[PDB]
Amino acid sequence: SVAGRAQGM
């Protein structure tokens, strides 16, 4: 999900 890039990991 995009939540993986929400922080940049």
Backbone as CSV, one residue per row, in Angstrom:
resi,resn,N_x,N_y,N_z,CA_x,CA_y,CA_z,C_x,C_y,C_z
1,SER,0.853,-1.223,0.000,0.000,0.000,0.000,0.876,1.256,0.000
2,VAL,0.306,2.386,-0.325,1.104,3.649,-0.347,1.655,3.954,1.049
3,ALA,1.053,3.405,2.071,1.546,3.662,3.457,3.027,3.282,3.577
4,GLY,3.530,2.499,2.657,4.964,2.099,2.721,5.842,3.295,2.352
5,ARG,5.375,4.131,1.466,6.181,5.321,1.064,5.804,6.535,1.921
6,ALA,4.808,6.406,2.764,4.404,7.557,3.628,5.622,8.079,4.395
7,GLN,6.550,7.212,4.695,7.774,7.642,5.427,8.987,7.563,4.498
8,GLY,8.924,6.723,3.497,10.068,6.595,2.551,10.861,5.331,2.878
9,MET,10.184,4.224,3.049,10.895,2.953,3.371,10.383,1.820,2.476
